[PDB]
Every structure is written in structure tokens, then in C-alpha cells.
Write a protein that binds this ligand. Structure first.
Ligand SMILES: N#Cc1ccccc1C[C@@H](N)C(=O)N[C@H](Cc1ccc(Cl)cc1Cl)C(=O)N[C@H](CC(=O)NCCCNc1nnc(N)[nH]1)Cc1ccc(F)cc1
Ligand SMILES: N#Cc1ccccc1C[C@@H](N)C(=O)N[C@H](Cc1ccc(Cl)cc1Cl)C(=O)N[C@H](CC(=O)NCCCNc1nnc(N)[nH]1)Cc1ccc(F)cc1
Lengths: 306, 306
């Protein structure tokens, strides 16, 4: 029993974190085989950040301008290239701790574990969702940039996020590991605004199923809804539209609990219209949207507590 | 910016998790140097669990009855002993991945990271507090027993919890790594009840300071309280009494924010008496009590956002 925001075990990623320094700028990098990946704005000085021309900045650099430190050993940079907003530093030593890995670009609504790092040393691990507006609500301080987000599947690490900046509103923006930003953002020190965010409906439904699996049913009701009528309520409360694909993805949880997806939608509709009236679900007084259906299946029992 | 429940990086503990099997009972063990630590009820059959005499059960066992598996290698048990409710299996191989470590018995109100494991394989990491009634609100399924809780300080792992059982109410009970239960519990399969729980007042205050550091002040007020008058309100709302020791521990956070501890107590009093009126603090609609003052200092900026 129980239900917690649960990160993946971080050891396979810990062994890949390094420190990258150029001039007086230091941030984190990801060392896989003989390549170190890091945000390209490491090459900027504080004045370069306002409006940098990165190609003009990088051509003025040499391999030996980059200082890469893995624990207490320096790695010699023997080549460098830029791929979108990530810098790739070829080093003379392959990381002996390289896990099986993939780079993946995730969809909004998906979750991942963040290994927050400072000066190449891991400090903590927590779970994040990619918001519909392509920000994440992380916990990051100066020096965190280059920290990565990941999922793990049978000892393969799928890296999906590299941290690049905190926006003026205090939420966070970054790239896939091939250097493409999530969302409309660019890597320059300008005040950039995210689009208006929405609540991840399929995730709230997954979390309601988690609550039922764990033995709680107080929010259920005898009603059902059509998909169309549910989405009319969803729009009113700034929830993302629920698609038939979402309904299909919730199939297994519906089958395990015996609660049809559109019946759980009717529960959610009632919760949105009436509130919780002082009650909690899985210890929360708000409707939680940062658990995917996969996250629920991963953590909850495979048999519902009746 | 941001504030999340943040676990310690788990790699140093991952390399210590093994599987222990006796008869048809399999659970997790902790492999440090040439000793494997695990819950002693691994030696019980399903019938032994009702009321076991562990000394009588253990004297009937031989070293070779214990099967210890570390990944895909078997460790030979060359001795065994019982220390309170933990079994210590001496094996013929020292763990090459043993971190610097200590065993510590924590006080209620302290937090730790849990590495949830099944069949000796880590599955997830999350943060827990030891409740005032000496349970934890974990997330655990069958096979999790022997999973450990820990804190890390400058590459030293302080192990403080080993998981032994889920109570009828779905909360969790366990021991320190020397086998002494937290709370009044015993390791037998009987319905055991925890004492009535309370809210960890010093932790709620720490979390209010975290909110101020992150830039939010809406809950502050112009009032102050005496310690005695605050604790009269604390008792009404099932909060633990606040001691002068707690006030001292909050000293650094008070100094960083410029908010006296007894002034923050007056904010908390108003929040308890009036509720939040539809507002949130650090994204929560409830008052959070599973962040210690240390947890806040560890994660938040050292300079308040004014
Ligand atoms: N993670 C992180 C982090 C956090 C703090 C400091 C440093 C870092 C890592 C570091 N690498 C980082 O992100 N630096 C960026 C600057 C940067 C470097 C490089 C590139 Cl390519 C792009 C960028 Cl934008 C940075 O300084 N951003 C600040 C963070 C801030 O001041 N936050 C407090 C207010 C939160 N909002 C709030 N609080 N309360 C209310 N009600 N609202 C916001 C900003 C301000 C002007 C601006 F024009 C753009 C952005
Ligand atoms: N972690 C964990 C875990 C979770 C499930 C299964 C297995 C494990 C690990 C495994 N090692 C474990 O803990 N087994 C224990 C049995 C045990 C083994 C050895 C020793 Cl020394 C001591 C003990 Cl007690 C066990 O089966 N406990 C069940 C768990 C249960 O059935 N939970 C569903 C209800 C939650 N409550 C609720 N849900 N909804 C509402 N409103 N209330 C509770 C119980 C039931 C009778 C009883 F007499 C004592 C305790």
C-alpha cells in the first residue's frame, strides 16, 4: 500500500555526471562513452548571454579552452561540435560507467526523474512532468544547468531532458539530449514567457485509479458521461482535452479496477464541479496530474484492494 | 527556484542490495563488506509467522539453508547470527561497492530516502519521514521487505531504516539497522495498531520558511505569539508541542528570512484557525510536515528572493 512520487534509482546516471568549465562559466555535463554533452551556453561570458551568436563564439574556441572534470580527474577534450543547443565534447577517455542508454524526446504529459547536480556532483533526485506548456516545475539553483532528466527501463537509461534555464516565473526550460528545446524557448538571457498551462487530464484519471487500487472509492459515483460532454467540462476548468487515445491508454487500469474510463470521467467531473469538500485523495487536497498511467502501473499493486 | 520532495542520489545504496532466500521466503538484504543484513523473519514459513520463537527457529538452520544472490552471482554464507530483529549473514565475499557508511537510529520527525527494492533489485526512490507514532507512510508491495532508508552526508551513507511489515492500516513499520523496531511493534504476523499520530510542527514551520525563501509571503501577518500560547493552539489541532530546541534549530532559517520564529508561529496559528481559503503554499493545499529544517537548507537557495 501507499503512493508516493517515486523517482528511478539514479546510480546509472550518477556515474555519468561531470563538470564543464569555459572561462569563468561552470555547469554540468553528461559523460557517455567518449563524449560529454552539455548546454552550449557554457561558452558564453556574462555579456555574451544577452544575445549570443553561438557559431561565431564557438569558432573562437579551442579544445583546450574546455576543462572537463570527472570527480578528481581531468578529461582532455580532443574535439568539439555543436548540435542545436548542446555542445558535444569528444574526450580522450571513454566513461567506464556508461550504462545502456538511449536519447528520447518526450511528449508533454510524460514524467521523468531529475538528477539535480552542482559542479558535476549529484545532490538529489525527484520526479517531474513535462507540462503541456513545455516547462517543468523543477527545483534548481544556480549551477544546476546541465542536470539531466531520465527514465529507466530494464537497465536502459532513456535520457529525455537537459536543464538550460529558469524562466522569470521560476519554472524551468530545457532541451532533449540532441539540443532541441521543449517549447518555443531559446538559449539567451532574455525574459521569456511560457504559454498558458493546463492540467494533464489523463494523468489525473490515472491517479484516481491509483487511489481505487489502494483501497479508496469515496469519490466514485453511479453516473457516466460521454467523451464529448466530459471534454466540455474539461475546457471550463482548464483541463486538457481527453482523447480516445487517452481512453485506450487507461484500458489496463480500468480493467484492473472494474471502473470504466467514462465512469471515472464522471467522477472527475463531479470533483471539478463540487470540489473535495474537505476530503483528501492519496493524501492530497488537490487533484494530482504528474503521475502517468505507466507510473501508476509501475508503483501500485497488480491486484486491487477490494 | 522550486521546492520538491527530494531524495538523496541512490547509487551508493543500489550497489549494496541483494536477495535473501530461505525455504520459499525471499526478501531483500543489505550487503556491506562481508555481511548481509536482512529481516530475521526470512527464516519463518507462512505458519511460523503467527507466533515465531526465532531462537528456536534459527538454531534449526544451517549456513547453506540461506541463498544470497547479488545480481547473477551467489554468495556463500559462512556464518549467521541474530541481532534483535535483523539477521546477519557472513558471506565469503566482501562487497567491492561498499560505501563509507554508518548505522544511525533516528528520532521521530526526521526524514530519509527509501530505496524500494524487490528480489534484490532497486525499483524506485522516495522521501519519507518517521512519524511521531514511529510508522512511515511508505509505498511498498509484497517482496519489499528488507528495503532500506538512508541519508547521505559527504559520500557517507547513514542507514537508518530497514523495512519489516505493513500494518493493517497500510502504513509501514521497521527497524534500525541493528534490528530494533521504531515504535512498539514486534515482527510477527499479528494485527498491530500504531499510536495516534500527530503533525510535526517544527517541520511545518521549516516548510513555511522554504516558501518565503522561494518568494511567497501571503500567509505572513503582523502578529506574534508566545511559545506557550502557540502550543495551546498546537494541542487543539493535533500538532506536536514546539520546544525551545525546535526554536533554536529554526534559527538559521529565521536569520536568512528576517522572520522571527515566534512570528512564523503566529502565521501558522492563523493558518490553522482560518485555513488557506483556497490558496496554496509551494503548490500544496495542505500544510506539509515531511521537510525538516535541514531538508529546507539543503534544497533552497542560501539567499531569500526578496
Ligand atoms: N535553474 C536555475 C537557476 C535559478 C537561479 C539562478 C540560476 C539558475 C541556473 C542558471 N543556469 C540560470 O537559469 N540562469 C538564468 C539566466 C539564463 C542563463 C543562460 C541562459 Cl541560456 C538563459 C538564461 Cl534566462 C537566470 O538567472 N534566470 C532567472 C532566475 C531567477 O532569478 N529566479 C528568481 C525569480 C523566480 N520567479 C518568481 N519568484 N517569485 C515570483 N512571484 N516569481 C530568471 C530570469 C531573469 C531575467 C531573465 F531575463 C531571464 C530569466
Ligand atoms: N510493505 C508491504 C506489503 C504490502 C502488502 C503485502 C506484502 C507486503 C510486504 C510483506 N513483507 C508484509 O508486510 N507482510 C505483512 C504480514 C507480515 C509479515 C511478516 C511480519 Cl514480521 C509481520 C507481518 Cl504483519 C502483511 O501482509 N501485511 C498486510 C498488508 C495488507 O494486506 N495491506 C492491505 C490493507 C492496507 N490497509 C487499508 N487499505 N485501505 C484501508 N481503508 N486500509 C496487513 C496485515 C494484515 C493482517 C495482519 F495480521 C497484519 C498485517
Amino acid at each position: 500500500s501507499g503512493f508516493r512520487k517515486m523517482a528511478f534509482p539514479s546510480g546509472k546516471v550518477e556515474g555519468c555526471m561531470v563538470q564543464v568549465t569555459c572561462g569563468t562559466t561552470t555547469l554540468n555535463g553528461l559523460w557517455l562513452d567518449d563524449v560529454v554533452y552539455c548546454p552550449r551556453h557554457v561558452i558564453c561570458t556574462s555579456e555574451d548571454m544577452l544575445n549570443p551568436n553561438y557559431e561565431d563564439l564557438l569558432i573562437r574556441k579551442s579544445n583546450h579552452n574546455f576543462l572537463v572534470q570527472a570527480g578528481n580527474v581531468q578529461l582532455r577534450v580532443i574535439g568539439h561540435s555543436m548540435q542545436n543547443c548542446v555542445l558535444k565534447l569528444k574526450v580522450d577517455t571513454a566513461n567506464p560507467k556508461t550504462p545502456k542508454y538511449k536519447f528520447v524526446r518526450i511528449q508533454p504529459g510524460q514524467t521523468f526523474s531529475v538528477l539535480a547536480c552542482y559542479n558535476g556532483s549529484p545532490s538529489g533526485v525527484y520526479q517531474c512532468a513535462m507540462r503541456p506548456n513545455f516547462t517543468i516545475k523543477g527545483s534548481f539553483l544556480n549551477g544546476s544547468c546541465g542536470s539531466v532528466g531520465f527514465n529507466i527501463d530494464y537497465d536502459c537509461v532513456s535520457f529525455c531532458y537537459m536543464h538550460h534555464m529558469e524562466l522569470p516565473t521560476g519554472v524551468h526550460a530545457g532541451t532533449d539530449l540532441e539540443g532541441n528545446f521543449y517549447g518555443p524557448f531559446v538559449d539567451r538571457q532574455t525574459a521569456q514567457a511560457a504559454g498558458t498551462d493546463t492540467t494533464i487530464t489523463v494523468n489525473v484519471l490515472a491517479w484516481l485509479y491509483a487511489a481505487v487500487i489502494n483501497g479508496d472509492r469515496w469519490f466514485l459515483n453511479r453516473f457516466t458521461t460521454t467523451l464529448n460532454d466530459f471534454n466540455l467540462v474539461a475546457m471550463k476548468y482548464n483541463y486538457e482535452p481527453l482523447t480516445q487515445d487517452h481512453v485506450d491508454i487507461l484500458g489496463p487500469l480500468s480493467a484492473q479496477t472494474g471502473i470504466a474510463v467514462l465512469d471515472m470521467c464522471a467522477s472527475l467531473k463531479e470533483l471539478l464541479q463540487n470540489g473535495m469538500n474537505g476530503r483528501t485523495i492519496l493524501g492530497s487536497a488537490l487533484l494530482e496530474d504528474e503521475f502517468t498511467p505507466f507510473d501508476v502501473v509501475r508503483q501500485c499493486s497488480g491486484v486491487t484492494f477490494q
